[PDB]
Amino acid sequence: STNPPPPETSNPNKPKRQTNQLQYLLRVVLKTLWKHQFAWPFQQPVDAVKLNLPDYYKIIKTPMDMGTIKKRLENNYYWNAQECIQDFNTMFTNCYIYNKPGDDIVLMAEALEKLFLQKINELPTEETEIM
Ligand SMILES: CCOC(=O)c1ccc(-c2csc3c(=O)cc(N4CCOCC4)oc23)cc1
């Protein structure tokens, strides 16, 4: 068709780790985002073939979505919280560079992003490890 396989969520070489900030991201930030009115387009990888998105994978070199992010959180895939935050920003900016400003999907991403920036500002200022 063809869609690339979902992004990796497990790191054999890359070391596993957990912090109170990654914990807050999973148990609070992502839980709030997941039930937003506009979460559903971002809950799984973009099926660009079924959606007939021309050149989507030529233009979007790093596909990203909240289902991948959630599983990476559940797999301690991230070293720290800022790494998780980068995947969220990649998901939002993917949508902004691919679509006309002000389109429906862009409005949905913008509203999710606005909620996301609000919740990540509740993150503990100090990072502390977890077993
Ligand atoms: C089977 C039903 O699922 C959906 O309705 C669905 C799922 C994911 C997306 C989505 C996520 S990012 C993104 C993008 O960057 C651009 C497009 N477009 C643009 C051209 O109009 C059409 C959707 O869609 C998406 C959109 C709809």
From Swiss-Prot:
Effect seen on changing N99A: Abolishes binding to acetylated histones
Location in chain, cross-link Glycyl lysine isopeptide (Lys-Gly) (interchain with G-Cter in SUMO2): K58
Tissue-wise expression: Ubiquitously expressed.
Subcellular location(s) per record: Nucleus; Chromosome
Modification after translation (UniProt): Phosphorylation by CK2 disrupt the intramolecular binding between the bromo domain 2 and the NPS region and promotes binding between the NPS and the BID regions, leading to activate the protein and promote binding to acetylated histones. In absence of phosphorylation, BRD4 does not localize to p53/TP53 target gene promoters, phosphorylation promoting recruitment to p53/TP53 target promoters.
Residues the UniProt record annotates as site (Acetylated histone binding): N99
Assembly: Interacts with p53/TP53; the interaction is direct. Interacts (via CTD region) with CDK9 and CCNT1, acting as an associated component of P-TEFb complex. Interacts with RELA (when acetylated at 'Lys-310'). Interacts (via NET domain) with NSD3, CHD4, BICRA and ATAD5. The interaction with BICRA bridges BRD4 to the GBAF complex. Interacts (via NET domain) with JMJD6 (via JmjC and N-terminal domains); the interaction is stronger in presence of ssRNA and recruits JMJD6 on distal enhancers. Interacts with NSD3. Interacts with NIPBL. (Microbial infection) Interacts with bovine papillomavirus type 1 regulatory protein E2. This interactions may serve for the tethering of viral genomes to host mitotic chromosomes allowing successful partitioning of the viral genome during cell division.
Misc. comment: JQ1, a thieno-triazolo-1,4-diazepine derivative, and I-BET, a benzodiazepine derivative, have been tested on tumors with success. Treatment with GSK1210151A (I-BET151, a I-BET derivative) has strong effets on mixed lineage leukemia and promotes myeloid differentiation and leukemia stem-cell depletion.
Entry function: Chromatin reader protein that recognizes and binds acetylated histones and plays a key role in transmission of epigenetic memory across cell divisions and transcription regulation. Remains associated with acetylated chromatin throughout the entire cell cycle and provides epigenetic memory for postmitotic G1 gene transcription by preserving acetylated chromatin status and maintaining high-order chromatin structure. During interphase, plays a key role in regulating the transcription of signal-inducible genes by associating with the P-TEFb complex and recruiting it to promoters.
Domain notes: The NET domain mediates interaction with a number of chromatin proteins involved in transcription regulation (NSD3, JMJD6, CHD4, GLTSCR1 and ATAD5).
Protein name in UniProt: Bromodomain-containing protein 4
Organism (species): Homo sapiens
Residues of the full protein shown: 42 to 172 of 1362
